[PDB]
Amino acid sequence: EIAQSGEDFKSFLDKFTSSAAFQYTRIKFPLKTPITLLADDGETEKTFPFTKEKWPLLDSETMKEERIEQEEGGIYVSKFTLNEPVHKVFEAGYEESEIDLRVEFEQAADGKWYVVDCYTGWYGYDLPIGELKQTIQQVKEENAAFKEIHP
Numbered sequence: 292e293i294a295q296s297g298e299d300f301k302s303f304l305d306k307f308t309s310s311a312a313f314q315y316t317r318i319k320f321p322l323k324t325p326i327t328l329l330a331d332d333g334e335t336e337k338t339f340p341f342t343k344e345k346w347p348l349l350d351s352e353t354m355k356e357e358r359i360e361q362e363e364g365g366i367y368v369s370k371f372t373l374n375e376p377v378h379k380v381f382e383a384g385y386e387e388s389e390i391d392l393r394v395e396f397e398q399a400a401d402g403k404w405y406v407v408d409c410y411t412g413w414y415g416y417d418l419p420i421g422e423l424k425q426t427i428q429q430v431k432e433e434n435a436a437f438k439e440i441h442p
């Protein structure tokens with residue numbers, strides 16, 4: 292569960308979520324899994340590299356493990372589904388739905404933690420390819436908000 296050398300994961304994650312500049316330094320772009328969307332033709336899958344300009348900054352609230360029971364009926368669950376000394380995977384989503392976030396963390400040979408892959412519902416398979424550019428701009432605007440409180 293806990294690494295015997297290098298960076299402590301919980302301490303890393305607190306720094307990662309508290310500073311945008313630091314966060315960007317600890318993501319290995321392009322991520323392992325590219326963004327995959329269906330073309331308008333309705334048959335061809337198109338991939339786009341998951342690069343720095345597309346990254347939605349992750350805050351401390353998002354990275355908390357918890358179970359949210361909503362009055363309107365949903366149960367939203369976030370948890371580390373893999374929790375090994377040098378390899379962790381965080382998943383979040385509504386119970387009985389597909390997940391809307393998966394973040395994969397690995398402690399590299401230098402002892403530092405990095406994000407090496409991510410699935411985010413911002414770029415879900417349900418996103419029309421024609422909306423990708425504007426979605427990326429929306430993420431930029433969210434990131435501007437993040438940077439007002441977590442530079």
Ligand SMILES: [Cl-]
Nearest residue numbers: 360361362363
């Ligand atoms: Cl409730």
